[PDB]
Design a protein around this ligand. Sequence first.
Ligand SMILES: CC(=O)Nc1ccc(Oc2ncccn2)cc1
Ligand SMILES: CC(=O)Nc1ccc(Oc2ncccn2)cc1
Lengths: 304, 304
Amino acid sequence: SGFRKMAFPSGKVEGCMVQVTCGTTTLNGLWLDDVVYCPRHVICTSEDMLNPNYEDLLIRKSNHNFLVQAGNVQLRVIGHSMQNCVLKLKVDTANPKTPKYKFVRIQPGQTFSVLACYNGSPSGVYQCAMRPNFTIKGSFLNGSCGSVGFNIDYDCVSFCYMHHMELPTGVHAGTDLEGNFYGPFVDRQTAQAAGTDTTITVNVLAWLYAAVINGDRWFLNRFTTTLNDFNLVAMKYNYEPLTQDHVDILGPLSAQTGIAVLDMCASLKELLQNGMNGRTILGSALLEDEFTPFDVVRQCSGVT
Amino acid sequence: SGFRKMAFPSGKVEGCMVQVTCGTTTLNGLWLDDVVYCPRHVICTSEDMLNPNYEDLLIRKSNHNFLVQAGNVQLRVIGHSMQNCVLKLKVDTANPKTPKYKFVRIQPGQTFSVLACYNGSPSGVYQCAMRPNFTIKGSFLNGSCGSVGFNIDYDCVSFCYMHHMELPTGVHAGTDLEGNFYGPFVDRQTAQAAGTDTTITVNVLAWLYAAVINGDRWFLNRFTTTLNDFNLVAMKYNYEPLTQDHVDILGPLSAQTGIAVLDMCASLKELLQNGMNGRTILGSALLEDEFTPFDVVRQCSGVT
Ligand SMILES: CC(=O)Nc1ccc(Oc2ncccn2)cc1
Ligand SMILES: CC(=O)Nc1ccc(Oc2ncccn2)cc1
């Protein structure tokens, strides 16, 4: 029993982290097979960042201007290309620790672990969600760029995120491992205002299930609701609309607990309208939205 | 910027996790050098657990009754002893992945990462504190016993916890790696009521510092207080007494932010007396007490 914000074990990703230096910029790269992936803004000064022309900056760089260090051993760069907002550095050595891996582009509301790194050295791991405005609320200092977000399915690491930017509001923007930004963000130091940070309704319901399963039941009420009725209250509270797909996804938690999804919706409706009245749910004073239904089932069943 | 509940990278501990089976009980062991550490209740049936005589149960066991599996390779057990509440199984092979390590007994209020495991396979990592009543609020299902808590200093893993028990109230009890329980708890399935779960005041102040450093400043007030005055309010709110040692420990955060410790105490005093009024601090609706001053300095400076 007990329910924790749990990251995936980080070991398989720790074995992929390298330091990339281009002139006076150092940040992190991901070494998979004989390729190192890193933010293309490694080639930028902080002055470059105000209005970089990446293609033009890049022409001045040779393979030997990219210094790749894995632990305290330098890798030899034998090729470099730009793919969208990532650089791919071909090195002469396949990472001996390459795990089985996929590159996946996640949808907003999906959760992932981040291995926060500096000079290619891991400092910590934490669990995130891709917010509905395609930001993440990370912990990222200068030198953390190239830190990656991932899920693990048994032995297969699915890489979903690479850290590129802190927006002036202190939230985080980044790309998939094809170098495409999540949302409308760009690797330029300019005004970039995120949209509404809505609450991931389906994740909140999952976490209310997780709570019931762990003995926190005070918020269970006598009411039900309908998707359309619930969704009027969701709109009012900057909660994502709930779809029949979300209902279906919560089906197994519904089954395990014997609480119909729409009953738990009515419970959430009362929490939104009445607040917590100084009470907590799984040790939180607010409604947690960074557990997916899959996360709740994994953690509550004990998947390794 | 941003501030996250961050675990240590788990890789060095993942390389130490094995499965220990004694008859029909399977749980996790820690393989360091040629020794595997595990809860001594591996030798118990769930019936044994109601009133186990460990010495008497243990006499019936031979080296070959202990099945140690590292990945899908069996280790050969050449010795077993009981030390307090842990079994030490001598195996004929030194773990090739043994990191530099220490066994340390932490004090209440100190934080650590847990690698939650099942059948010797890691499922996740999360950050904890030893509560002032010597419990932890973990996430631990059946088969999770032998899962360990640790800090890392650069390359040296300090092991501080091994998971033994879920108390009837759903909180967690365990030992150091010498097999001594934190607090008054015992490896027996019986009424064991934890004391008052007080809030780790020094950790809350550290986290208010972390917040100020990350731009959450709304709770900064015009008041100061004294240790004795603050401590009257702490008592009332089941907060640990603040000592001059805690003040000293917060000194560097004080220096970095230019907010005297007693001013931040007066800020906390107002939060305790007035509550949050529906506001948040680093995305929490309650005062977080599972960051140490060391944790705040590490995460805010970027230590790897
Ligand atoms: C686009 C730019 O500004 N400079 C650049 C041009 C061609 C390049 O050649 C290349 N090499 C290996 C694989 C793929 N591509 C690399 C970098
Ligand atoms: C205490 C008990 O009930 N049974 C037991 C007795 C002596 C033991 O010998 C031993 N062997 C190696 C190192 C240290 N000790 C082991 C287990």
